[PDB]
Amino acid sequence: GSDAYNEEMLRKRKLTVLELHPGAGKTRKVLPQIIKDCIQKRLRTAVLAPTRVVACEIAEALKGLPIRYLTPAGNEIVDVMCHATLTQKLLTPTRVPNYQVYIMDEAHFIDPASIAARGYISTRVELGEAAAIFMTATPPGTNDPFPDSNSPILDVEAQVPDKAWSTGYEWITNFTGRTVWFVPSVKSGNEIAICLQKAGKRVIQLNRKSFDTEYPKTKNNEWDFVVTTDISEMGANFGAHRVIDSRKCVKPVILEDDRVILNGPMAITSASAAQRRGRIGRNPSQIGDEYHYGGATNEDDHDLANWTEAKILLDNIYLPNGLVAQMYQPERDKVFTMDGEFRLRGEERKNFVELMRNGDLPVWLAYKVASNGYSYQDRSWCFTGQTNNTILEDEVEVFTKTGDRKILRPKWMDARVCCDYQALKSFKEFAAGKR
Numbered sequence: 377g378s379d380a381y382n383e384e385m386l387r388k389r390k391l392t393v394l395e396l397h398p399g400a401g402k403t404r405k406v407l408p409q410i411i412k413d414c415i416q417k418r419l420r421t422a423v424l425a426p427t428r429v430v431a432c433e434i435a436e437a438l439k440g441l442p443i444r445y446l447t448p449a450g451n452e453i454v455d456v457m458c459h460a461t462l463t464q465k466l467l468t469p470t471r472v473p474n475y476q477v478y479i480m481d482e483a484h485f486i487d488p489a490s491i492a493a494r495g496y497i498s499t500r501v502e503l504g505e506a507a508a509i510f511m512t513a514t515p516p517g518t519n520d521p522f523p524d525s526n527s528p529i530l531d532v533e534a535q536v537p538d539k540a541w542s543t544g545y546e547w548i549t550n551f552t553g554r555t556v557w558f559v560p561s562v563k564s565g566n567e568i569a570i571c572l573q574k575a576g577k578r579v580i581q582l583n584r585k586s587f588d589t590e591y592p593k594t595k596n597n598e599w600d601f602v603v604t605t606d607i608s609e610m611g612a613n614f615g616a617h618r619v620i621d622s623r624k625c626v627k628p629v630i631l632e633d634d635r636v637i638l639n640g641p642m643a644i645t646s647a648s649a650a651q652r653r654g655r656i657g658r659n660p661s662q663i664g665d666e667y668h669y670g671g672a673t674n675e676d677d678h679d680l681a682n683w684t685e686a687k688i689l690l691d692n693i694y695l696p697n698g699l700v701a702q703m704y705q706p707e708r709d710k711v712f713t714m715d716g717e718f719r720l721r722g723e724e725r726k727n728f729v730e731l732m733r734n735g736d737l738p739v740w741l742a743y744k745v746a747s748n749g750y751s752y753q754d755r756s757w758c759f760t761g762q763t764n765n766t767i768l769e770d771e772v773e774v775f776t777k778t779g780d781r782k783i784l785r786p787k788w789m790d791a792r793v794c795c796d797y798q799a800l801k802s803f804k805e806f807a808a809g810k811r
Contacts, residue, residue: 377515381406383413386477390507391498393483393515397526398654403511404437407479410509411438411454414477421454421477424462424493426485429611431456434481460489466496466693468729476506482610483510484647488739491686494704496693503699510704513654514647517706521649521673525657529665536622536670538564538641540571547668549575553617556602558609558652560624560641562586565603572601579603582612606644609651613658618666621652623673628681628738628792636681636740636790643674683710685739691718692725720746727752734811736802741790748787758807761787766794766803777809 377395379402385392396402407423414421423443425431434456435445444452446461455473459480465472478497483490494516500506513523522531537545538559548555559565562583569579580594582604594602597615602608606625625648626640644652649669656665677683690701691713700715702708720728720743728746731737735752737745750757759774759782766772772784784807793803805811 379406381410381509383417385509386410386413386417386419386507388476388507389501389504391501392507392509394509394511395515395524396511396513397524398513398658399526400433401526403481404433406511407434407437407481408441410479411441411443414454415441418453419476420473421479422462422473422475423454423456424459424478424480425456426459426482426487426490427611428458430481431458433611459485459487459493462493463489463496463689463693464733466493467689468733474505478506478508480508480510482512484512484514484516484651485610486645486647486680486682488682488685488689491682491703491707492689492693494707495686495690495701498704499695499699499701514650515706516647516704519646519675521646522653523650525654527657527660527663527665529653529657529667530618531653532666532668534620534668534670536620536668537568538622538624539567540574548620549577551618554597554600554615555618555620556604556608556614556616556652556655557620557622559603559605559622560626562605564622564641565605569601569603572603577601582608606648606652608655609648612655614655616656617662617664618668619653619656621649621667621669623649623669623671627677628740628790629679630681630684630740633684633744634788636738636792638791638795643671645675645677646673649673678710678712681738681740684713685743687711687713688718688739688743691716692720692728718743723751724749735806736811737806738790738792741788741793744788753809755807755809757787759783759785761785761789764789766800768800772800772804774804774807776807782807 379394379396425434442452444455446455446457497508501508565581569581572579577600579601580590580599582590584607587607623644624641625644626638628636629639630636653667693701703711724746728742730752731742731745745757764785766784773781774784776782794800
């Protein structure tokens with residue numbers, strides 16, 4: 377694919393993918409060119425970043441242009457927001473400008489709200505109401521683990537250990553410079569960190585929890601190893617020389633529409649493998665950048681909660697005249713449910729929104745509660761299943777809004793609300809009517 381923008385990509389019915397090499401040297405000389413042109417042509421433009429990190433990067437690039445920065449809360453016709461901000465506005469009937477132009481950065485993001493916004497955007501574009509530009513090193517549909525790069529990358533199939541080692545693995549410990557090592561879980565990373573410091577290496581550990589505090593500590597490069605989960609596949613830049621990829625993740629997976637579990641280690645998609653690899657090969661300067669990788673790559677991931685969630689969101693975004701919001705074309709092969717299967721109506725839909733918005737419940741859980749006639753402030757469903765016992769140690773008592781010391785045992789189990797301590801406590805709060 378190509379990285380070259382031209383102004384013909386802004387006429388209505390156009391959907392373009394700019395396949396950019398990872399670097400600031402293109403996205404942040406390109407995005408401004410597109411935005412200047414949208415201003416030149418008086419086009420109501422929406423610019424969509426995956427995370428808060430990438431929006432503050434986009435804002436920097438566009439400083440001194442008339443841009444409005446949106447959040448969940450007059451001369452500017454160009455609005456910057458998170459993928460999730462768009463999808464939220466769509467779900468919760470809040471007025472959104474008739475955007476003639478959507479620019480989605482990291483348009484591979486496999487996050488329920490991203491998929492669903494790609495679905496809505498592509499639909500509007502098909503109908504002749506808008507143009508769209510999706511920017512991504514790894515477009516949906518592509519299946520290439522080793523894409524184009526800025527510098528050459530040396531790709532190396534290798535024995536990569538998932539726990540500490542005493543002997544062997546000279547290649548890992550010899551290395552002069554700087555390594556990003558992608559792991560499935562923190563515990564696996566913890567084990568590997570300790571092994572590394574028992575070879576006098578210095579290791580920053582990045583995960584969803586540690587990220588905001590530790591990501592900045594790597595910016596000054598006084599480290600030999602960053603040991604990271606898939607948090608670092610998106611909006612995370614390093615001065616590294618090589619990448620070691622286990623080629624594994626842990627994902628929320630649906631078993632049985634009756635249980636979501638966190639299943640791993642399993643094999644990552646080719647997009648994830650490309651993004652992990654994509655931390656190196658960024659600077660034409662640095663030529664001996666390497667990528668040592670473990671297991672194989674797998675695109676059969678229908679099981680993932682994320683794909684059912686995206687579809688739940690999409691079915692609940694409304695369009696005039698019996699039109700059907702479909703997924704971006706390359707991602708339709710992931711949805712197996714009928715169009716409008718998950719559509720909720722009136723009371724059920726308002727509760728669905730409030731349970732995600734004010735409830736902080738996963739899309740899947742929120743759907744299951746609203747699906748079954750249950751209201752926002754009714755929490756009876758938390759204590760009226762069986763063998764769905766959440767446990768601290770050995771059985772979690774809770775002190776309700778209205779009396780009892782009821783035992784917590786919800787009708788539906790989502791691992792994502794009892795996988796942490798902050799997760800569980802937050803879910804305890806919820807059963808207890810206390811938000």
